[PDB]
């Protein structure tokens, strides 16, 4: 089980999307194109709605099939966007998590993507998550997206 933390070098907002949210679109698209079914775990319902819109536009000139959890075809869309209240569809290969605290369901996945936001006020939360992935037996690494 591997957990990768992407280091953000900015907190530049575009079209109502946080720098992390923008990165999520790029990573979800890349992972789906590699042949994976993807779960995006949002912190809240409103963030799920933002990403459901954004993934039709980002990356540009791309068709990335996706839906909110509970919507789309049977078994869910190739990329599914869930939030704490919402049961996600199963048989997914990679979790991209926006949850501010470690989510117990993360242990269901062999590949997890998490983030270290640029804002100092968000660093403590990120450190806490990193610790919790370690306790749950994940092999940890940090990376910069290209």
């Amino acid at each position: 089980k591997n957990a990768t933390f992407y280091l953000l070098d900015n907190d530049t907002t575009v079209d109502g999307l946080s720098a992390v949210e923008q990165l999520v679109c790029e990573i979800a698209a890349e992972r789906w194109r590699s042949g994976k079914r993807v779960l995006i775990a949002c912190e809240d319902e409103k963030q799920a709605y933002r990403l459901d819109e954004a993934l039709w536009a980002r990356p540009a000139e791309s068709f990335v099939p996706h839906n909110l959890a509970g919507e789309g075809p049977r078994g869910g869309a190739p990329v599914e966007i869930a939030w704490p209240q919402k049961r996600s569809s199963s048989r997914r290969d990679i979790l991209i998590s926006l949850r501010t605290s470690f989510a117990d369901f993360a242990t269901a996945f062999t590949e997890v993507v998490d983030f270290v936001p640029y804002e100092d006020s968000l660093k403590q939360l990120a450190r806490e998550r990193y610790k919790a992935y370690r306790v749950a037996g994940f092999n940890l690494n940090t990376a910069t997206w290209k």
């Binding site: 933390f5 280091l7 270290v116 660093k123 990120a126 450190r127 990193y130 610790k131 940090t142």
Partner: peptide, 4 residues
């Protein structure tokens, strides 16, 4: 050890 946390690298950030």
């Amino acid at each position: 050890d946390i690298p950030f």
